Amino acid sequence: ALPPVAKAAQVVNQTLQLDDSYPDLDSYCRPGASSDYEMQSSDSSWAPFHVVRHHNIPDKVFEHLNAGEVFTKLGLFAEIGYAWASIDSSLFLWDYTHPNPELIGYEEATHTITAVALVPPKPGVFVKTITHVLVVATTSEIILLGVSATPTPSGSKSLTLYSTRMSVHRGGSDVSFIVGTKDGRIFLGGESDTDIHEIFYQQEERWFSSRCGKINHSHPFGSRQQEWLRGLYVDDTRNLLYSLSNRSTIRTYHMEGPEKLTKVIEKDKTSCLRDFAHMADSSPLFTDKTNIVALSPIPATEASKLHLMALTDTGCRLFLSATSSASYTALAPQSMQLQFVKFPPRESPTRIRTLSQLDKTSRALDPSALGFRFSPGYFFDVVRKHPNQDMLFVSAPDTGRIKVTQPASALKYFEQGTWIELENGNRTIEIGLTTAPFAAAKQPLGFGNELAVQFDQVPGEFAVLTNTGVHIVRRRRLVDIFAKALGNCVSASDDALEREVRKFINQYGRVETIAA
């Protein structure tokens, strides 16, 4: 009754639905806590990440850096494969993928540069060939430059700069953090206070309005205690903006319009600690002495409830939900609550290979100085136990185990982890994604299915900027691990393969293993 190709198409349709039923983040990070890790040696074929190459800082940048009179700073434009260095009032960009790069110098600025960022342009403003806007903040003003990052035959963007006549006086508030939205909105913050500013700009000059303006969205007044920002974070999928303060206060702002920004949540460390105390498992790794060192937004495509990850200096990952009071009038949330905690692993890095309760006391990630999360959960933590050498903890969801876990009530935040050692003197500065953002589906269910996209998009790669160079870290897929493991079985017995294969079956299941 039903011919071959139609029968096989039925199998495809049911297989597509099976891959798109991969558990969403909310489902395996339910209220509670977890310490589930399988640690892998960095030199192992089972390593979830590994360093593929490194790019030294050009010698000319070292000449300028050591010629610094007062202030210097480094940063990453990982989206286009560029890095930058500021020396006092001078800025230098370069393509770090190029073996002998030329330095793009920009020295028009009159005062010390305090922040630099590469953001999308405002639509309908610039010629289509302008791909980005370069924001340069000094102690006196903020400067906008047009950017065209067109790809070259070699695979590294060609960068040319355009003047704009767009600039505004800074004012009294320091600018150390610049972030941009998908639509080209530019937000500013710094180390003077917790105020958030926005830069507006338009093509036409008017007699009653300049081409470029600046406004303070915080509208402060009266008595104000000392407090400033540690970072700004954007989530376009929810039209939200987050700030982290030096007191570990998390503020949430909603973009109710193309020119509006409204503060909708303010959650201090005490509130986080109160939520934590109401959880079943309390821990000495999170107290009133603990600092939150970084935030990472979680987009709505990845999870409905969990909006935000917060990293403590003890290495705890705090996952916070946010909820609106109502269901209709984007809808702004009005509450934020600490729901789930991923506690640190226990295994420390070792030169020699060393040999079920919730582990809520590990110090392996203490102190955590910098932290980053990328969908579907790739986690980088800069652990600074010693003041000269950084250790990099890198982990990923155990996609294979999460996909096979049954029933749904048994789902936990299983992870594969590893330690990547940086040489003595390497101080990590920034980590950015070099490939396209990960997404296996368009909604939380199916979103995190790494297995499904092994052959549709290249493995994620991450540029780790240090004070000596840029290191490229690459995510390894099942097929990469399987191929590497088999490569070690080439010189062994019939039973040597069967043993290695059984490791894969016990983690990924038989079908996924045979498919690899």
Binding site: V125, V127, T160, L161, Y162
Partner: peptide, 14 residues
């Protein structure tokens, strides 16, 4: 080498 800054005329339309 100081980067050549092409003019605003090309940059913004129309």
């Amino acid at each position: 080498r100081k980067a050549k800054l092409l003019p605003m005329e090309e940059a913004l339309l129309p």
